[PDB]
Design a protein around this ligand. Structure first.
Ligand SMILES: [Cl-]
Length: 315
């Protein structure tokens, strides 16, 4: 083939930043396999904010285009709903497009009390994108859990995922700094999947929660509730750390888990995170592929040829 679990592809961190891509449509047209978005749920008032730093309104390249004819025409700095609108417009204009993973960092976690929890997140994505999403319900099928499904049968072929979006969730830097014991994005969303599954409602889910932070063994052992563990089939961590000798990355490949390796440029010997040479970047992607990455991410927006790279995972 390959399948979504046997390939290595390339992502762009903070793809909503105007400095990288004038419009979000440009991020979508970059060829990248993974585009990362920073969302805020605990700002005041309505909407999920899109912003790198503490939001004042939004700071993004998203336009909220109503259709493809409107892409690259509107004022930017739109919110998550606006981003999703751009995605839908672009999707409708590019039937059979490459599968794209939207990696969402929930900067400040969820805000269920304020109407921005896992259920409302799913509902918004369903409203905007509908059938274009490949989510946990799709992967899991009739299996008891996502883990059971993925280990036994793996992911669909890349060809079969044409015209699909997938979503990954990681906890954010702000909730990592909370002195209180509010549940983090990972436990909250995984618990949501567990609860949906118990209610026979997994089909309405839209995103895969990831275990964030490179670790040896089975990283899911960090969760004291074993019932949450099989809802994590995506792992996200520092590339240099994954390559430092302490972690057996073949484990992920054998089990068909998705492995996102961040800051790919910081793997020694370090190369530029934005403007490396094409040769340097390609070599780095190949190195990470051999080390069983599903995705290698950095800021290589100047290198769309590299961003489009898809190679076999694990040699
Ligand atoms: Cl697979």
């Amino acid at each position: 083939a390959t399948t979504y679990g046997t390939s290595t592809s390339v992502g762009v961190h903070n793809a909503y930043e105007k400095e990288k891509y004038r419009y979000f449509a440009d991020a979508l047209d970059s060829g990248a396999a993974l585009l990362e978005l920073d969302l805020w749920s605990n700002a005041l008032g309505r909407s999920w904010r899109v912003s790198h730093s503490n939001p004042l309104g939004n700071n993004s390249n998203c336009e909220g285009a109503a259709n493809a004819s409107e892409l690259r025409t509107k004022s930017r700095d739109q919110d998550f709903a606006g981003c999703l609108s751009d995605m839908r417009a672009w999707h409708d204009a590019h039937p059979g497009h490459r599968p794209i993973l939207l990696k969402i960092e929930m900067k400040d976690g969820f805000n269920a009390k304020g109407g921005r929890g896992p259920a409302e997140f799913d509902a918004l994505i369903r409203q905007k994108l509908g059938d274009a999403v490949y989510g946990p319900g799709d992967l899991t099928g009739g299996h008891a859990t996502a883990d059971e499904a993925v280990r036994a049968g793996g992911w669909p072929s890349r060809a079969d995922l044409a015209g699909k979006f997938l979503f990954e969730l990681i906890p954010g830097t702000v909730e990592e700094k909370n002195p209180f014991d509010k549940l983090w994005t990972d436990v909250e969303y995984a618990g949501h999947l567990k609860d949906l599954a118990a209610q026979g409602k997994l089909a309405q889910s839209t995103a895969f929660p990831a275990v964030h932070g490179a670790a040896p063994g089975d990283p899911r052992e960090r969760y004291a509730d074993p019932a949450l563990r099989p809802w994590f089939v995506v792992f996200d961590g520092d590339a240099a750390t994954y390559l430092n000798g302490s972690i057996d990355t073949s484990w992920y490949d054998t089990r068909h888990y998705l492995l996102i390796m961040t800051d790919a440029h910081n793997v020694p010997p370090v190369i530029d995170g934005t403007h490396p040479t094409e040769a340097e970047a390609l070599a780095r992607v190949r190195q990470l592929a051999a080390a069983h990455a599903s995705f290698a991410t950095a800021d290589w927006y100047p290198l769309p040829s590299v961003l489009k790279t898809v190679v076999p995972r694990g040699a």
